[PDB]
């Protein structure tokens, strides 16, 4: 016992992360979102109030840092190319379901970035 204060504070952090992680996996839907998937989902934005009901494009990378966990999608929508980043346990994402897998060698598929 009596570990150093910094050690105990980092412990508090790693704890109080999974606390809220479970506290949202008790009510939300998520898939496994391995890179190389092709994902579909929805986002209501707090600016307009709009909810586009769908977006689509390959998933290029993610960081499973915890409650914060970003991932990026190479949505080429009627334009040069649009790369998006979403935190996974958002209050917005709801339909994060449609996947279609691949076989990727790299882990962060960046080389697709032109």
């Amino acid at each position: 016992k009596f570990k150093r204060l910094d050690k105990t504070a980092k412990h508090i952090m790693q704890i109080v992360d999974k606390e809220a992680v479970e506290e949202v996996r008790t009510l939300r839907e998520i898939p496994e979102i391995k890179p190389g998937y092709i994902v579909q989902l929805k986002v209501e934005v707090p600016e307009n109030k709009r909810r586009v009901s769908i977006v689509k494009g390959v998933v290029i990378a993610r960081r499973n840092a915890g409650l914060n966990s970003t991932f990026r999608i190479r949505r080429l929508v009627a334009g040069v190319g649009v790369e998006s980043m979403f935190p996974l346990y958002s209050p917005n994402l709801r339909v994060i379901k449609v996947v279609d897998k691949k076989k990727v060698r790299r882990a962060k598929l960046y080389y697709l970035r032109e």
């Binding site: 016992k1 105990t8 412990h11 508090i12 704890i15």
Partner: protein, 141 residues
């Protein structure tokens, strides 16, 4: 954490020779703040003697060198710590003398014939338990 002030290739290619000599011989006398560094490669090369598989052997083939200290590890250091869980070197501070004020240090293994600080007995670890955060110890007096 130490750089020792050496290009990171030459630094390794020295530390390898040092751990390898620490296994060929049984004791060495070296500058302390570098003994404090072989303090890690020696143990991570004892763990491979303890595992001994083909994988974890062909890996040690890279980290140790000079002679067949490879076999020395695999054959005697395993069998002499098949039980000792962690902590396989002593790193005493002899500060004998140099002409450069550089400290000096005996570093050598544990359960030999003539060690330096006659050791404690190799006790198997107890198994893990769940950590808790009561913070209930007032420590008043």
């Amino acid at each position: 954490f130490r750089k020792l002030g050496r290009p990171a290739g030459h630094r390794m290619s020295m530390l390898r020779t040092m751990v390898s000599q620490l296994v060929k011989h049984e004791r060495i006398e070296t500058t302390v703040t570098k003994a404090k560094e072989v303090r890690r490669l020696a143990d991570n090369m004892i763990q491979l003697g303890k595992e001994g598989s083909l994988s974890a052997a062909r890996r040690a083939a890279g980290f140790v060198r000079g002679d067949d200290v490879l076999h020395k590890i695999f054959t005697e250091l395993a069998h002499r710590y098949k039980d000792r869980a962690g902590g396989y070197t002593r790193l005493l501070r002899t500060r004998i003398r140099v002409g450069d004020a550089a400290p000096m240090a005996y570093i050598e293994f544990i359960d030999r014939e003539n060690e330096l600080r006659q050791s404690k007995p190799a006790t198997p670890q107890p198994p893990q338990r769940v950590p808790l955060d009561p913070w209930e110890r007032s420590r008043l007096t």
